[PDB]
Amino acid sequence: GIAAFEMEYTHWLEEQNRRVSEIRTALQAHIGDIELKMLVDSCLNHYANLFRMKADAAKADVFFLMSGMWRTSTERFFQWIGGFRPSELLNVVMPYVEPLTDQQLLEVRNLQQSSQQAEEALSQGLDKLQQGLVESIAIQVNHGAPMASAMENLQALESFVNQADHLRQQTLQQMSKILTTRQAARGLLALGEYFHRLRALSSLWA
Amino acid sequence: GIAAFEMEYTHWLEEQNRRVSEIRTALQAHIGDIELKMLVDSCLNHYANLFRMKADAAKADVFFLMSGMWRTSTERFFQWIGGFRPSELLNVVMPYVEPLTDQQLLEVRNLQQSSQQAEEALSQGLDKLQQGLVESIAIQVNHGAPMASAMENLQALESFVNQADHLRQQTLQQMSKILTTRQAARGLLALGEYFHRLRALSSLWA
Ligand SMILES: CCCCCCCCCCCCCCCC(=O)O
Ligand SMILES: CCCCCCCCCCCCCCCC(=O)O
């Protein structure tokens, strides 16, 4: 399952590079909103596919998915529950989706605050689960309960990952409704270049 | 380098199982201190070889060594800077090295307190390094400085790992001087069975 995920993610990155390049070329050519929206929607569809493949990987090996060892070294410094922190990515793209109207500014900052609150609450719940596993493993005839208990805890860990990816996807979705097509394209370009620069830097660390 | 480490560690575990079994058989046969000390010293030599292979792996890929992803899932709940926490392992073996004399009790508790203090200080330094890398990567013509800076930071991370393994080895060494051969054998048996039980439990999580 993890081998399949790593191959799928490799191909996902190749397609990500293409979709980011396509939107770069479109912004530079100042193409109209209709053609540009197709590229925005393609980028959004591509992220949706990432979340799908991550959900499968979490079922296959939640610990590996959580370790971030499938991402590059520099990306791991910015990981929160199996991916990036949406509240921080909002700061990354903020200068590029500007200028924002007053209403858009209120909507984006609201979204950032609510994502921050959701991230903190999920982190607190995951912390409680993890500390409790530390304590319970430490204490721990096999009639089947130990494996069943392990599967309950794996399901609980997977739920945290799923909820974190849900928050990431929901934040991307809500930005796509706040922003015009052109603002969204600029934000997606910035987000894509951010991820690419982190991966490029990891090559220097290797 | 990491592929070589994982193969070396696999063979290390196979030999660990043999050395733990050999000392189990010896304790049960109530063999004399001279033959028993050979088995104690073999166990100590085997841990020394673990630290050697870990030092090579830290040079090859410090992040992988630190991730603990080369250990089994349940062991990762108990990892501190690239391995187990010596102060906690002292608690694991304490019931089995008993009865201790008053002097031995003072020496062991002293060692546990000093290891705890060293662990906290190393954790604080690693935390400062890591938070500073988060901040500096976030801020970050290439004339060679970015790679050189990465190598300085990798060397600093490797130093923390090396210092943590030094503390682990020093604690094992100092226990071997406090304890009689028979107490040491009982403690090594307990430590070995502890690690084996954690690995066995990880099979249930998989
Ligand atoms: C129309 C969108 C413009 C740009 C919006 C950026 C802010 C949304 C943050 C969520 C991005 C999700 C991608 C991360 C995937 C992962 O962590 O594995
Ligand atoms: C004579 C020794 C008796 C038993 C002493 C146990 C307490 C010492 C703790 C250090 C053990 C080191 C093994 C861990 C290796 C690792 O973390 O990678």
Side-chain angles (χ1 to χ4, degrees), chain A residues 37-51:
Chain A
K37 193 177 176 301
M38 306 189 281
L39 297 172
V40 168
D41 286 344
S42 288
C43 288
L44 296 172
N45 163 280
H46 199 49
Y47 284 120
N49 277 114
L50 180 62
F51 298 125

Side-chain angles (χ1 to χ4, degrees), chain A residues 77-78 137 140 154 197 205, chain B residues 78 137 140 154 197 205:
Chain A
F77 285 92
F78 302 97
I137 287 161
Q140 188 172 24
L154 289 173
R197 284 192 56 161
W205 287 62
Chain B
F78 302 97
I137 287 161
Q140 188 172 24
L154 289 173
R197 284 192 56 161
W205 287 62

Side-chain angles (χ1 to χ4, degrees), chain B residues 50-51 54 71 83-84 89-90 93 168 171-172 175-176 184 187:
Chain B
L50 180 62
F51 298 125
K54 288 178 75 185
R71 286 212 154 120
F84 285 84
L89 295 180
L90 288 167
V93 307
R168 286 180 270 263
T171 301
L172 190 60
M175 275 314 267
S176 82

Side-chain angles (χ1 to χ4, degrees), chain B residues 137-172 174-181:
Chain B
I137 287 161
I139 293 169
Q140 188 172 24
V141 182
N142 183 341
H143 293 281
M147 190 166 78
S149 176
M151 296 172 66
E152 290 174 352
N153 287 310
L154 289 173
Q155 174 187 72
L157 288 167
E158 284 163 30
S159 182
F160 277 103
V161 174
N162 295 349
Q163 280 182 87
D165 276 346
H166 183 57
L167 183 63
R168 286 180 270 263
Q169 180 141 216
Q170 272 184 347
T171 301
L172 190 60
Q174 289 164 323
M175 275 314 267
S176 82
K177 303 302 199 203
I178 294 164
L179 298 180
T180 66
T181 290

Side-chain angles (χ1 to χ4, degrees), chain A residues 31 55 57 69 80 102 130 166 168 176 194:
Chain A
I31 67 157
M69 273 319 272
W80 162 77
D102 305 333
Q130 269 161 13
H166 183 57
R168 286 180 270 263
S176 82
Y194 172 75

Side-chain angles (χ1 to χ4, degrees), chain B residues 21-23 25-34 36-58 60-87 89-127 129-172 174-189:
Chain B
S21 180
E22 292 143 23
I23 211 168
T25 292
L27 285 165
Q28 284 174 348
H30 303 93
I31 67 157
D33 278 350
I34 287 174
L36 191 55
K37 193 177 176 301
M38 306 189 281
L39 297 172
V40 168
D41 286 344
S42 288
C43 288
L44 296 172
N45 163 280
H46 199 49
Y47 284 120
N49 277 114
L50 180 62
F51 298 125
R52 178 201 48 75
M53 81 176 56
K54 288 178 75 185
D56 287 346
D61 189 339
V62 69
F63 291 121
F64 176 80
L65 189 287
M66 297 185 76
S67 77
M69 273 319 272
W70 53 283
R71 286 212 154 120
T72 69
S73 49
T74 69
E75 304 177 83
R76 280 168 227 159
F77 285 92
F78 302 97
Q79 300 301 277
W80 162 77
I81 314 188
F84 285 84
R85 187 180 292 272
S87 66
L89 295 180
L90 288 167
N91 286 335
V92 164
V93 307
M94 195 55 177
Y96 305 95
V97 300
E98 289 272 2
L100 296 176
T101 67
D102 305 333
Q103 181 181 358
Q104 290 181 313
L105 182 76
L106 290 160
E107 297 247 14
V108 173
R109 298 297 199 201
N110 188 49
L111 182 57
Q112 178 169 51
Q113 178 179 63
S114 68
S115 65
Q116 256 159 6
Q117 286 164 1
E119 293 157 8
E120 269 157 20
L122 284 164
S123 288
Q124 286 180 44
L126 181 60
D127 277 356
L129 177 57
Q130 269 161 13
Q131 179 58 235
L133 288 173
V134 166
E135 268 142 41
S136 79
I137 287 161
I139 293 169
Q140 188 172 24
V141 182
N142 183 341
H143 293 281
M147 190 166 78
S149 176
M151 296 172 66
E152 290 174 352
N153 287 310
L154 289 173
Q155 174 187 72
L157 288 167
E158 284 163 30
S159 182
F160 277 103
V161 174
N162 295 349
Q163 280 182 87
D165 276 346
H166 183 57
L167 183 63
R168 286 180 270 263
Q169 180 141 216
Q170 272 184 347
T171 301
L172 190 60
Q174 289 164 323
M175 275 314 267
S176 82
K177 303 302 199 203
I178 294 164
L179 298 180
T180 66
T181 290
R182 203 154 309 266
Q183 286 170 318
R186 288 198 305 272
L188 289 162
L189 175 62

